[PDB]
Amino acid sequence: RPTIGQQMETGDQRFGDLVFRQLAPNVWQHTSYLDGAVASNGLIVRDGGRVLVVDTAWTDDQTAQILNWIKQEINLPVALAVVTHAHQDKMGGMDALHAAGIATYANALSNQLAPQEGMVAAQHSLTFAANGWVEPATAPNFGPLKVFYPGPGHTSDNITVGIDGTDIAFGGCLIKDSKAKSLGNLGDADTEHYAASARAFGAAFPKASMIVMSHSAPDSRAAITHTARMADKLRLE
Ligand SMILES: [Cl-]
Ligand SMILES: [Zn+2]
Ligand SMILES: [Zn+2]
Numbered sequence: 659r660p661t662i663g664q665q666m667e668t669g670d671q672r673f674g675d676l677v678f679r680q681l682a683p684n685v686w687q688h689t690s691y692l693d694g695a696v697a698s699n700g701l702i703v704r705d706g707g708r709v710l711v712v713d714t715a716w717t718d719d720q721t722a723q724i725l726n727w728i729k730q731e732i733n734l735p736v737a738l739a740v741v742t743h744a745h746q747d748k749m750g751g752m753d754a755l756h757a758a759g760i761a762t763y764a765n766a767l768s769n770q771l772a773p774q775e776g777m778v779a780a781q782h783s784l785t786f787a788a789n790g791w792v793e794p795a796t797a798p799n800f801g802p803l804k805v806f807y808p809g810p811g812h813t814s815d816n817i818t819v820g821i822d823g824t825d826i827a828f829g830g831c832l833i834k835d836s837k838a839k840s841l842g843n844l845g846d847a848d849t850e851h852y853a854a855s856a857r858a859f860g861a862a863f864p865k866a867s868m869i870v871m872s873h874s875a876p877d878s879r880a881a882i883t884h885t886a887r888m889a890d891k892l893r894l895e
Contacts, residue, residue, distance in 0.1 A: 661673050663678070675723075677689040681870070684703060684705070684823075685701060687701060687702075688701065698715065699872055700712050701821075701870065709737065710737060711739035714748065718757075725754065740803065741762065743765070744768040744769075744771045744777050745775060748872070749777040752780065756781070768780070768815040784805060790806050804863075805818070806862040809854060810852070812843075820866060829869055829872075830871065834871065836877050841888055841889065849892050849893055857886050869881045
């Protein structure tokens with residue numbers, strides 16, 4: 659059974675109970691929902707003759723449906739997935755990736771925290787230099803994916819990804835959009851270092867003009883400065 663895409667008034671395409679949006683010739687945003695209802699975004703990148711995934715959906719079934727979409731619309735093997743912190747929205751579908759033979763990667767800290775956060779750890783751990791950049795030996799054949807740990811923010815373990823050859827960087831749950839009224843789920847957050855991490859993210863990917871994030875539509879760099887400003891407000895109490 660194929661699924662046909664259900665095009666929307668916004669140009670997203672519905673496929674099952676997921677939404678897919680093309681951001682650039684070789685980059686798509688994937689969106690899944692949990693019940694109110696709550697959107698979570700990740701990315702799919704075509705890199706020559708393989709596909710790379712950033713984040714799962716909330717569930718194994720939704721993540722399986724992402725894999726079906728890739729099979730049906732791109733038709734290339736998924737070489738690896740990178741997940742950006744240890745919460746359900748980002749790591750809730752690991753078993754589906756593992757069932758499909760996909761090699762998975764996460765911050766070593768994300769893997770250490772996963773059992774406590776109710777998550778399945780990834781198979782491989784990314785480690786980071788003191789300047790925040792991924793150690794290249796721990797992220798082999800990541801193609802255009804540039805992984806950067808900006809410091810504690812939304813969580814202690816949150817990491818971020820830039821896409822070489824595009825103007826796209828993925829803030830994950832660290833960044834919120836330019837109209838956001840708060841910083842959201844602050845249960846696991848570092849209120850002291852959040853602002854510095856958000857600015858570190860901006861400095862790490864200075865040529866990114868499209869900032870993709872977990873919980874709203876892509877936004878400009880205004881999301882970065884807006885998030886930092888809200889993070890400062892908070893730190894001063
Ligand atoms: Cl599940
Ligand atoms: Zn989170
Ligand atoms: Zn989240």
